[PDB]
Ligand binder design. Structure first.
Ligand SMILES: O=C1CCCC2=C1C1(CCCCC1)N=C(Nc1nc3ccccc3o1)N2
Ligand SMILES: Cc1c(C(=O)NCC2CCC2)cnn1C
Ligand SMILES: OC[C@H]1O[C@@H](O)[C@H](O)[C@@H](O)[C@H]1O
Length: 392
């Protein structure tokens, strides 16, 4: 129970290209990659036009492939947790006949991005898909597969848009083809990550700022609870609706426009539950601004305190934690050298994120595992690059 090895892109490339040479009988022409993500702080704020502070991970999805001349798409994935079958072929969608979600589920992410890809003419293509992002494990495996697909389609047929327009295609694939009405964060960080930086994203204006996060004395420890309660899927849209009810009641376009003071004075305009949801949201936006300021001046102790307040708010007000994540966090915070820890992503399972002195990392891992009633998985990750292309 040491940290799980993260394969370099080169091992992933070598594996994908071999599988491709075997599967299709020729060398692939193209390779792309897009990372998974951990959100340092700013949870359940993106769809509230809030602030988020994710970083791209050294875990990533790689596509290798070649355009076809017959208008068909032919896919193979090797990812272990992928659902059967591992292969799927389908014709390109047309104005007459669209793609539709189905089986196997892993291909719905690719189909969705193809369906909403904005530029024409898109040729068909053959592609192999491999990934080190744990599938469905809370680090945005699906966003990385969407953005990798998008980054591949740009090579088949360049688009002429902005990065946020690409994120929104990928978000639409997730909404329509995976049935998960996500905000913009995961797609945007997968696109926009830079090595050694976190990305402050303003989800109202779509301004982004690269915040340096690279200090050998510091580490980021990701802990996978390896649990995912069914609520991760069904209660996420419930939270979106509750935030929208509160913004409507207060006559605000979004909770970005609402402050705690304003909220407390309109306490009689919303449900008790709604008040709790919106108090989290307004507070988390302020905490994300404060955390970004702290990171910049190298104030990790303060950054870690804000992380802990974010977890408590998520646990108690937004109510999207779970006993597994809580036990993970309470264990991390008992380790000397740990600045702060909190659940990351949507909640009801998945991962926690911990900011700690680098030297403290193996102690945190032994202790967190021992106080965890389940089986934990660990990643030590630096801030990674976002989507990349390599001609083969
Ligand atoms: O079960 C659901 C529910 C929760 C979110 C989660 C999914 C599935 C569906 C099919 C396989 C298991 C998980 N996978 C995506 N992500 C993803 N599947 C990939 C396949 C190849 C490469 C990259 C990939 O990313 N996320
Ligand atoms: C900038 C970059 C790359 C790259 O040159 N191309 C991406 C494809 C090669 C296989 C995936 C890989 N990893 N990173 C971070
Ligand atoms: O911050 C909570 C997050 O839950 C996700 O993982 C969803 O995909 C994101 O858009 C964001 O809303």
């Amino acid at each position: 129970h040491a940290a799980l090895r993260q394969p370099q892109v080169a091992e992933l490339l070598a594996e994908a290209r071999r599988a491709f040479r075997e599967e299709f009988g020729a060398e692939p022409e193209l390779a792309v990659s897009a990372p998974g993500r951990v959100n340092l702080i700013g949870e359940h704020t993106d769809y509230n036009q809030g602030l988020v502070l994710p970083m791209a991970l050294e875990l990533m999805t790689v596509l290798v492939g070649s355009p076809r001349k017959d208008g068909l798409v032919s896919l193979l994935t090797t990812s272990e947790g992928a659902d059967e079958p591992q292969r799927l072929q389908f014709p390109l969608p047309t104005a007459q006949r669209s793609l539709e979600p189905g089986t196997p589920r892993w291909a719905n992410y690719v189909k969705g991005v193809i369906q909403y890809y904005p530029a024409a003419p898109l040729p068909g293509f053959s592609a192999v898909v491999v990934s080190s992002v744990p599938l469905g494990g809370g680090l945005s495996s699906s966003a990385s597969l969407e953005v990798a697909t998008y980054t591949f389609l740009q090579q088949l047929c360049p688009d002429s848009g902005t990065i946020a327009a690409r994120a929104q295609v990928c978000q639409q694939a997730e909404h329509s083809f995976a049935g998960m009405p996500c905000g913009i964060m995961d797609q945007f960080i997968s696109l926009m990550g830079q090595k050694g930086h976190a990305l402050l994203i303003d989800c109202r204006s779509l301004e982004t700022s690269l915040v340096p996060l690279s200090d050998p004395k510091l580490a980021v420890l990701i802990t996978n609870s390896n649990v995912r309660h069914s609520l991760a899927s069904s209660e996420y849209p419930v939270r979106r609706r509750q935030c929208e009810e509160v913004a409507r009641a207060l006559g605000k376009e979004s909770l970005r426009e609402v402050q705690l003071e304003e909220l407390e004075a309109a306490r009689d305009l919303v449900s008790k539950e709604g008040f709790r949801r919106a108090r989290h949201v307004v507070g988390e936006i302020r905490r994300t601004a404060q955390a970004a300021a702290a990171l910049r001046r190298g104030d990790y102790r303060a950054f870690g305190r804000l992380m802990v307040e974010s977890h408590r708010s998520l646990r108690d007000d937004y109510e999207v934690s779970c006993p597994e994540l809580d036990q993970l966090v309470e264990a991390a915070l008992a380790v000397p050298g740990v600045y702060g820890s909190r659940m990351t992503g949507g909640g009801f399972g998945g991962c926690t994120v911990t900011l700690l002195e680098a030297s403290a990392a193996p102690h945190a891992m032994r202790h967190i595992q021992e106080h965890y009633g389940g089986t934990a998985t660990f990643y030590l990750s630096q801030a990674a690059d976002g989507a990349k292309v390599l001609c083969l």
